[PDB]
Amino acid sequence: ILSSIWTEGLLMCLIVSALLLFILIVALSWISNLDITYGALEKS
Amino acid sequence: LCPVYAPFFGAIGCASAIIFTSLGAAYGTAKSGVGICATCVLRPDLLFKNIVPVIMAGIIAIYGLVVSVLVCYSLGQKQALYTGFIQLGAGLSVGLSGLAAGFAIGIVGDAGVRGSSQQPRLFVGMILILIFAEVLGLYGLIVALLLNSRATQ
Amino acid sequence: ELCPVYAPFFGAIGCASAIIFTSLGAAYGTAKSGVGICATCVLRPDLLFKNIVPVIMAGIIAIYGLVVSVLVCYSLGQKQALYTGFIQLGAGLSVGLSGLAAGFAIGIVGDAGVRGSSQQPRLFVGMILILIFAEVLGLYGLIVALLLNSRATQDVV
Amino acid sequence: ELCPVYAPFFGAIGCASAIIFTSLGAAYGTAKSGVGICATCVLRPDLLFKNIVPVIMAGIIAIYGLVVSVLVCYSLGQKQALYTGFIQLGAGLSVGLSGLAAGFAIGIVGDAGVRGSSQQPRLFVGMILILIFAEVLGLYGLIVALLLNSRATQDVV
Amino acid sequence: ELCPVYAPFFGAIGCASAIIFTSLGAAYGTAKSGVGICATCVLRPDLLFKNIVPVIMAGIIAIYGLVVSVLVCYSLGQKQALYTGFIQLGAGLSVGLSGLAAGFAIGIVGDAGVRGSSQQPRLFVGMILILIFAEVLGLYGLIVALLLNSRATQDVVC
Amino acid sequence: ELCPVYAPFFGAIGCASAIIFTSLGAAYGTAKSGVGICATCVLRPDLLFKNIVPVIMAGIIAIYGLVVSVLVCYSLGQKQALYTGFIQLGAGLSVGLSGLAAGFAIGIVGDAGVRGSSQQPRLFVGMILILIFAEVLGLYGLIVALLLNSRATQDVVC
Amino acid sequence: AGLATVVTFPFMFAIMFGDMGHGFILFLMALFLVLNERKFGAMHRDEIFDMAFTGRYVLLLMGAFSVYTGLLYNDIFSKSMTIFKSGWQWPSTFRKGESIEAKKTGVYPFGLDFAWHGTDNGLLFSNSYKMKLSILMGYAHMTYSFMFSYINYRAKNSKVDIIGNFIPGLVFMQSIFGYLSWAIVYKWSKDWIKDDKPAPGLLNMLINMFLAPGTIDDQLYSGQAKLQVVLLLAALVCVPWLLLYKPLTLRRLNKFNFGDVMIHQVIHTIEFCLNCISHTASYLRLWALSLAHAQLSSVLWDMTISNAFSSKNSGSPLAVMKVVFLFAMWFVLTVCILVFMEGTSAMLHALRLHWVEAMSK
Amino acid sequence: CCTVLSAFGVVILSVIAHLFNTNHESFVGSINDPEDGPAVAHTVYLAALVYLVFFVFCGFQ
Amino acid sequence: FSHFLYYLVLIVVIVYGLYKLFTGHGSDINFGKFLLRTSPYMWANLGIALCVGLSVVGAAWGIFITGSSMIGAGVRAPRITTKNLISIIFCEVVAIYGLIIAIVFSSKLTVATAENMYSKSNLYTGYSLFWAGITVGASNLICGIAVGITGATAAISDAADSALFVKILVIEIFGSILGLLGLIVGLLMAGKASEFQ
Amino acid sequence: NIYAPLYAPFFGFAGCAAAMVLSCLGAAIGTAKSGIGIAGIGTFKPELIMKSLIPVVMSGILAIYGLVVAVLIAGNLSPTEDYTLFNGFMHLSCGLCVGFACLSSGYAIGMVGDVGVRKYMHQPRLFVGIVLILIFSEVLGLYGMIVALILNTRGS
Amino acid sequence: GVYFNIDNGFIEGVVRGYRNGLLSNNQYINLTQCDTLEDLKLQLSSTDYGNFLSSVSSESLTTSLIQEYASSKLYHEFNYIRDQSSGSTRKFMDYITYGYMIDNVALMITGTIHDRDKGEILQRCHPLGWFDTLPTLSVATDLESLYETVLVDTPLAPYFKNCFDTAEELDDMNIEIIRNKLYKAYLEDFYNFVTEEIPEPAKECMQTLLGFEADRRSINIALNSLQSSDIDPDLKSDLLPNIGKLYPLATFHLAQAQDFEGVRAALANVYEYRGFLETGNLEDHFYQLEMELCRDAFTQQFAISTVWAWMKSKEQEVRNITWIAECIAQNQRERINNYISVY
């Protein structure tokens, strides 16, 4: 057996849910860096 | 052969197929909608022809919705790891593809609707660029709908 | 084995995250597009009651989270299957992390739109049209979570 | 069981860490004070051997590590208790991460005092008076590790 | 048990560290002070072989690392005590991560000293004085590592 | 028990590291100095071949890594001792992470040296001397790894 | 190039947009503009409706071919048509809920067969059919538009351009992908079950034709191993010939920049030999978007009106307002997605298949 | 636009009700399909009449 | 804060490895048994999905890099906006590479019998499809970004002078070698891999 | 066989992927960063562009360096033959010592051959020195390919 | 260059398009062959200036109206590029205009000491350096009541850190000191902004373009202090910026430079500024070196320093057109080819 706590199925759920959470953190850091061009909305 | 943790991957694939696709569609709607709102304060008659990038970003989210619905009709309590990881792959494919296609449509769309108000010949240019970025969601949808057909065989 | 003891953990996280991340999305949509209302209704306050539509369409995302949180909450149990917990985790994340995106889009489009609608009054219809495409993202997440939650306890053992 | 095989690991890490972090603190305290000296006496080079006090007081807190990293080194055996390794690690960290703080304080006060003592001649007494409070930090860490190391092999079995 | 199979790992990464972390401090003391020589001797090139003392004192600590790496290398064996591996790791870290500090100090002091010794020539004897204190920080680590390495295989058994 | 099956992993990554980090340092030393060569030989075309000595000086670092990695490669075996893998890992790190240091030092010294040597012709000898003091770090790493690699397979058994 | 476009652009559209229901809707909303072209001509047209009315005859053909091809498929709002006699019969006596196969009686007369509709492995057969359909129609479109280059070089009276570009292009294209398109038809022609022979894989036949020549694991025809070597040599001899004929015979006729001709012919050779592979795999979007249209029209029907069909509460007001609301929700989703925001994508993909895959030969 | 949707609601639902009435195998022939044909045809034909009411009412607009 | 987590995970890995190694149980951190006992369908499906995902995130990356600068450079010179679309096309072909490799890989994805499930061949064809999906998706990612950068420079040098686009299209050709080389290597890696049996 | 376990092709296909991905990463950095400098001088003296395509060609050779070793690792991998863990570790190392070698060589070519091409529009005598520094920065990947070939022939 | 075109894709390609409208050497020779300001207008109408003087019609056309409208379209192009900017780019565009805000402050508070009317001392102000409380600098005389009333809400407020108001209100001698000290603190802050948040290809070629501004301002302060200033070097060293290539060794010798030779021997030790003070027009030497530093900032592609390198080159273009139109209107043609063209 691989382990009793860190079994064959838990340890490859925590790789899938680490890859997906990595893609999520990257995509949320893309959307967090999204700013509005305010000079093209004002009168000045 | 069909363990107890096997519908985790299918449920998280059904999750990610709409999550990453809606993140990409939200970036493609928001960033290209800033360009619509910035463009149409000095030339407002271009408002309903500049609406194409948010429509294409919505088509991306429809492509993700299709995969999420078609994955959640094949989930069961006692499915194999084969079905689970193939639903996971069908989720990841359309997730990364809709995310990439939505980022590309968002970054091309605001630049296109800004160049279209200065030069009128750039409307056909931005449409022909955004059609290449639209079908990348189709390129993930193909792998998602092919891995869906191999779910229970 | 089919119904373990740690199985309500994923169901409780799915009940929590559906309201947590939609409250984050609705909070960003209220916040970013309410700064624009408070900045552009110091000069033209006559259109204060029509700039409120980004805030309302942001607050619909929290109701999308609330419905799925109640429907996951009334399916939790002590001896539920691990399948039920996985489906409730997926339905919680499918509403939460999609309504977070919808709320980001509503906040960005609303702040960019209520600032440009005071200089050009014809941009309001375009703002509403873009915000409908931004709100159907959270609506699609609601559809995915309802189709999961109908599948949650159907043929469970 | 009381004296395992992996017991000299903590003593060797303590003997290294006693001199490693005091060398880092002394390096910071020498580096910033040397930049302050070499930038303050291109105009008044008569204060060259007068302003050497921050470099000396930063070099003393490395001798503070050199004392305890010899007194820990001469109590390292193959068959030593794990209690001895734990105390030698605590002593090495108590000198090291306190002399690192003392070196940070001496390095900031040193160049802040030698860049200003070229203007006011009686800021030198205040600079020494603040650097004494910055160097008793390393002295306190030395006292803590010398009280630890007098107990690492007192009543061990 | 008392001399396990993984016991030469700590001795090998103590032989390696005593030149790695020493040479990447000697490289800082060479580079950061050499950009201060090459930027100063464009106007005072007669001071070229006098301002190069920070580079020499940064090269001395790499020899301090080399001696300890050779003495840890020639005490490695296939069947050695784990105490010997711990002591050699401690000696390697004591040389490397303190010669890194001595190299940082020589690098920061040396370019500040050679850029200032061309405006005032009476700052060279102050640069040497600060730089001896900056350079003895690696000699202290060499003393600690040699006193460790003399204790490595003294009363080892099994 | 003493020559396990996973034992050539450490020798394999030691043979890899002596190319990886050494070519990374040599690439830094060629790139950052070639920026200065191409930036100063715009108005000083005749000094174009005197300024290659930082780039050649950084290429000798990659030659140092090449020699030690080939000499480790010709001692990897299937039924290899774990001591031998530990020694080859130490000898790979000792060349790689010291040639990276020497490459950092040559890359930061050499561009300032070719920028100052176009302005002052007597700074060239000082540049060459500082580059010798910077290359001797990677030479020290090669000395440590050649003295270390010669001890792999001396008294190995089982 | 807009004189072969007049049929091929609506037809390459219809291969991607294949349905008699959506095709009749698009034909009807095009024929509404064709019959009312006098009232709409003397009218101010905004840009979207000017685009839609300038092409009121591209959409009439795009509907008229979509009805034809969705009668070739059995796809009428993603349903089948039991018009002809089937080539498959199902067994009469079988247990409920078990997996059964059908026995082949004959072949279906016109179009695809309707016993593939509610079928587990029907989608595998539709994948094979539509992939090979896209390969053969892309081959036909490319070898039709490649003859126009020969007609151009013949009208310019340039035999140097013919022998330098057309012939080494023709016997490079036809010796690889003409052979693939022939091999698909020849595998369809043989039975492979009555003969008790293994059916060859055509992907790893073209993989092994370039890697391991002469080694045939599953024999597809007699004399395969020695004819594929001849075709491989005929394809490999035209990589130096198309690159070296024209510059070396323009240089010989000067006894003019030889660097501007040799580099241009190297770029032309690299581009053409790249594009012969890169376009026959790019015509598989005719299968991609057709699969997408068929599966979306299936899973919209199954979510909207498959829920409205129930034999309980027959004649009840709730059970008939259920059908009314679900038909309205189905129809607005078909019109909004599967016509306007799906056929526009099929239109643009049949457009880029002309702009790149056809207007570069 | 309600008259177009109502005309398609007449035509499509009338064809669907006729295909349920005649027990066509693309609508009844599966196990997941409804069992009784004319029971579904009776509630689809009334919806066809409802859309015909909408088509006649919006046809005089 | 991310550097704090990078240091914390490193400290936890070092403390766990040294605790597991000092107590004579250091072979319990067993990466080989982890590779032997995880399901090959994870590696296969993950390789297919990351192939078609990371080809598209490079294709879409290059599309916006040489699309936004094409539209910016086309404001004064609108005679580039159709000719220069081949720079969109060269960074778009790296997605069809990953697509036609993902479908060929998914053809090797059948149901293996449970008695021979963690066999030699079934585990081989999980490893091969995993790394041959990675080496195609990452290569098409990097190729799409490189072709997008060298097309964004070409879209501005085209608007500068018309005779420069022909000279800088060659850099896009040398940049688009890379995705085709990844296309070759990912087919050679899963060339001898059989189906799941 | 205890010397040839069934997880050994993991480290061989990892060697394939590390030999291809990092070498084409180095080749792409080397062609993109240098194409920036080549196109930057597109207006100022356009006649020096076709002469300056050498740091693009020498960057593209770094992908051939990874291609050769990726083919030679993938040719030693078969599900029917025995495959030792020694062979898998050796293929991991020979892909890993060519991937970062070509990555560093591509970073060096990209940083040298755009600054050189960008300063070459002022001084036309730079070109010999530019080509020389590109040769010294391109043999960095040749060293790693030599180590990878010797290591492949040793490990099999 | 991998993350540049997210927010700066459209911005660069239009500025790169604006670069192609820079007049080349042949387009300057075709302007020096003109005989009338009307012929120069019609020659500029074939360039990318086309029909910018269309509302003038040959009668009110002077050589200052050309400098007005040619710079006005520069300012409107800068505002169009700034309106499409967001994030760090928009902040970089604001930091460019801060140096014009400083000049408009120092030009507005000299029009009140001389009691010139407020409506005519504002048409001479710079349009890019506009802040909303710029006309309200005509309310007080001393520095403290102009800071604490007006200049606190301005973004020039962190730059009043060393301006010591000794309750002497204002002459013309200390407004130049306040101007130089505000520009000193501004050059410090904008160099730290470029070093901090601007990415690496647009960092090294912007630190040089900004250190050149600091070196030119240091030489101009240390050389204009000979004739119309009698100040101590300890008070003169607060006016010299410390970011440049010239600071740590040469601005010390420029601080105690009491004579012209104290400047010349100080600038003989620096390598790229030696020979400027020997022969020729010094202002032409600085403008030529400015254009040679702006030319090789267009040669790096994915950089936001192309905006700075564009607007300084376009300002030099407006200066060259103004010099030519001044030569062909006053009938002096002995130095008509004194323009500066690196494009």
From Swiss-Prot, chain A:
Changes seen on gene knockout: Reduces association of VMA6 with the V-type proton ATPase. Decreases VPH1 protein level.
This protein's source sits in the domain of life called Eukaryota
Q: Where are the transmembrane segments?
A: 11-31
Which residues are on the Cytoplasmic side of the membrane?
32-44
The record's subcellular location field reads: Vacuole membrane; Endoplasmic reticulum membrane
Oligomeric form and interacting partners: V-ATPase is a heteromultimeric enzyme composed of a peripheral catalytic V1 complex (components A to H) attached to an integral membrane V0 proton pore complex (components: a, c, c', c'', d, e, f and VOA1). Interacts with VMA21. Associates with the assembling V0 complex.
| Similarity field | Belongs to the VOA1 family.
Primary role: Accessory component of the V0 complex of vacuolar(H+)-ATPase (V-ATPase), a multisubunit enzyme composed of a peripheral complex (V1) that hydrolyzes ATP and a membrane integral complex (V0) that translocates protons. V-ATPase is responsible for acidifying and maintaining the pH of intracellular compartments. Functions with VMA21 in assembly of the V0 complex.
Q: Other remarks on record?
A: Present with 12764 molecules/cell in log phase SD medium.
Q: What is this protein called?
A: V0 assembly protein 1
UniProtKB/Swiss-Prot annotation, chains E, F:
Give the species: Saccharomyces cerevisiae (strain ATCC 204508 / S288c) (Baker's yeast)
Which named protein is this? V-type proton ATPase subunit c
Q: Which GO terms describe its cellular component?
A: fungal-type vacuole membrane; Golgi membrane; membrane; proton-transporting V-type ATPase complex; vacuolar proton-transporting V-type ATPase complex; vacuolar proton-transporting V-type ATPase, V0 domain
Question: Where can this protein be found?
Answer: Vacuole membrane
Query: Whom does it interact with, and what assembly results?
Result: V-ATPase is a heteromultimeric enzyme composed of a peripheral catalytic V1 complex (components A to H) attached to an integral membrane V0 proton pore complex (components: a, c, c', c'', d, e, f and VOA1). The decameric c-ring forms the proton-conducting pore, and is composed of eight proteolipid subunits c, one subunit c' and one subunit c''.
Q: What else is known?
A: Present with 8450 molecules/cell in log phase SD medium.
Q: Name the gene behind this protein.
A: VMA3
Query: Family per UniProt?
Result: Belongs to the V-ATPase proteolipid subunit family.
* Gene Ontology MF annotations: proton transmembrane transporter activity; proton-transporting ATPase activity, rotational mechanism
Q: How does it sit in the membrane?
A: Multi-pass membrane protein
Curated annotation (Swiss-Prot), chain G:
**Protein name, please?**
V-type proton ATPase subunit a, Golgi isoform
Cytoplasmic side stretches: 37-50, 149-166
* Miscellaneous section: Present with 1084 molecules/cell in log phase SD medium.
Question: Which keywords appear in this protein's UniProt record, sorted alphabetically?
Answer: Acetylation, Coiled coil, Endosome, Glycoprotein, Golgi apparatus, Hydrogen ion transport, Ion transport, Membrane, Phosphoprotein, Transmembrane, Transmembrane helix, Transport
Vacuolar face of the membrane: 18-19, 81-128, 188-230, 295-318
Kindly state the subunit structure of this protein: V-ATPase is a heteromultimeric enzyme composed of a peripheral catalytic V1 complex (components A to H) attached to an integral membrane V0 proton pore complex (components: a, c, c', c'', d, e, f and VOA1).
Q: Which residues of the full protein are shown?
A: 453 to 871 of 890
A GO biological-process term:
endosomal lumen acidification
Q: Which residues cross the membrane?
A: 1-17, 20-36, 51-80, 129-148, 167-187, 231-250, 270-294, 319-357
Provenance organism: Saccharomyces cerevisiae (strain ATCC 204508 / S288c)
Cellular component per GO?
endosome membrane; fungal-type vacuole membrane; Golgi apparatus; Golgi membrane; late endosome; proton-transporting V-type ATPase complex; vacuolar proton-transporting V-type ATPase complex; vacuolar proton-transporting V-type ATPase, V0 domain
Gene Ontology terms for molecular function: ATPase binding; phosphatidylinositol-4-phosphate binding; proton-transporting ATPase activity, rotational mechanism
Its subcellular locations are:
Endosome membrane; Golgi apparatus membrane
State the gene name recorded for this protein: STV1
Q: Which family does it belong to?
A: Belongs to the V-ATPase 116 kDa subunit family.
The entry's comment on post-translational modification says:
Glycosylated.
Disulfide connectivity for this sequence is none
Ion transport among the record's keywords?
yes
Swiss-Prot record, chain I:
Describe its membrane topology: Multi-pass membrane protein
Which residues, by range, are in coiled-coil regions?
Answer: none
Q: Which InterPro entries match?
A: ATPase_proteolipid_c-like_dom (IPR002379), ATPase_proteolipid_csu (IPR000245), F/V-ATP_Csub_sf (IPR035921)
Q: Which GO terms describe its cellular component?
A: fungal-type vacuole membrane; Golgi membrane; membrane; proton-transporting V-type ATPase complex; vacuolar proton-transporting V-type ATPase complex; vacuolar proton-transporting V-type ATPase, V0 domain
Answer whether the UniProt record assigns the keyword Ion transport to this protein: yes
* Its job: Proton-conducting pore forming subunit of the V0 complex of vacuolar(H+)-ATPase (V-ATPase), a multisubunit enzyme composed of a peripheral complex (V1) that hydrolyzes ATP and a membrane integral complex (V0) that translocates protons. V-ATPase is responsible for acidifying and maintaining the pH of intracellular compartments.
Identify its protein family. Answer: Belongs to the V-ATPase proteolipid subunit family.
What binding partners and quaternary form does the record give?
V-ATPase is a heteromultimeric enzyme composed of a peripheral catalytic V1 complex (components A to H) attached to an integral membrane V0 proton pore complex (components: a, c, c', c'', d, e, f and VOA1). The decameric c-ring forms the proton-conducting pore, and is composed of eight proteolipid subunits c, one subunit c' and one subunit c''.
**Record's protein name:** V-type proton ATPase subunit c''
In its UniProt entry, the species of origin is given as Saccharomyces cerevisiae (strain ATCC 204508 / S288c) (Baker's yeast)
Q: What gene does this protein come from? A: VMA16
